[model samples]
Target: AGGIHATDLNDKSVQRALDFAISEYNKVINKDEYYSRPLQVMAAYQQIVGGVNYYFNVKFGRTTCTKSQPNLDNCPFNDQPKLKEEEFCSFQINEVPWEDKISILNYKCRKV
Candidate 1:
């Protein structure tokens, strides 16, 4: 294992912000059922405030549809619902340092 660096910890807030944003997203979409997969970090950037703000490009496709017996043809989720939700959609997150506030800037779900 490598020792933690200050630079590593410097970006920890950004990581936590990303976590909270994705967690809340799944919580909202899946509700009581656990249907959402973990959000994948596609890209990230440090903001003007010397790392106080971070912009993230994240993507996630449903691992499983909300319905237990999901329709394969008209499935609202990804192409491979059985394996993992296909990577069909991408979203953006703008995180500010204060209270680790995170705002979802945009979202788009692609069609297969």
Candidate 2:
């Protein structure tokens, strides 16, 4: 085991952390693209310090709904392999449960 050990892929904390990370990612990227959803759990870990740090890499599949949708979360994913656009994103998010503070430690997404 390394400094960042393996954790449950379907953990609730992981899901919440991923949701926040994806939202933060959308705010910064100018993909001029549609919204995406997690298709595969590449890897994940939870490190405990003064706060909790979540490290995860997930594969995302592009959805039919564009970025301007009133509810991007409701967009349906394009499942056809011929017209699919997908990428892998790795994020490091830190959360202070007591303080209710969440911060992005690191954010990296795959290139075209």
- The prediction achieving the highest lDDT against the true structure is 2
Per-residue accuracy of model 2 over 3-53 as CA lDDT, tens digit each: 666676577776777788777766675374778767776555655767778
- Any idea what lDDT model 1 has? 0.50
Kindly report which residue stretches of model 1 are placed more than 4 angstroms away from their true locations once superposed. 1-10, 30-32, 49-53, 59-83
lDDT of 1 by residue, 1-112 (tens): 1222222324667567666666655555434343455444554454555224334445655644553454422334445635554334455555656554576666665433
Overlapping backbone residue pairs in candidate 1 total 1
lDDT (0 to 1) per candidate: 0.50, 0.74
Q: Output the lDDT of residue 39, model 1.
A: 43
Q: Which residue pairs in candidate 2 have backbone atoms (N, alpha carbon, C) closer than 3 angstroms, thus clashing?
A: none
